[PDB]
Fold:
Amino acid sequence: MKQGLQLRLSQQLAMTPQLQQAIRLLQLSTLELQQELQQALESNPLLEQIDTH
Amino acid sequence: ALLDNGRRGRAITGSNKRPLKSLADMIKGKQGRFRQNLLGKRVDYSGRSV
Structure:
């Protein structure tokens, strides 16, 4: 009956997707996966990788 | 550790329980540049035998 942009309180049935997260890790090869892991290690102080030094 | 390994504290070692070599290690010692490559060297046109 009308086409407008409004702010209102309604009761609606809502759908939403739930897939995309952590799926990018499957396609990556081992070398790119290690590079991404290094990038994650740099930003997160609580992540460490096993070393022999 | 990069500049001079083992001078301050405990030396950082590799997987073989052997301390790594730093720039100072290459500079000095009986295996450094001065005594191994500059005061003496291997040469061409030379041989040896009994």
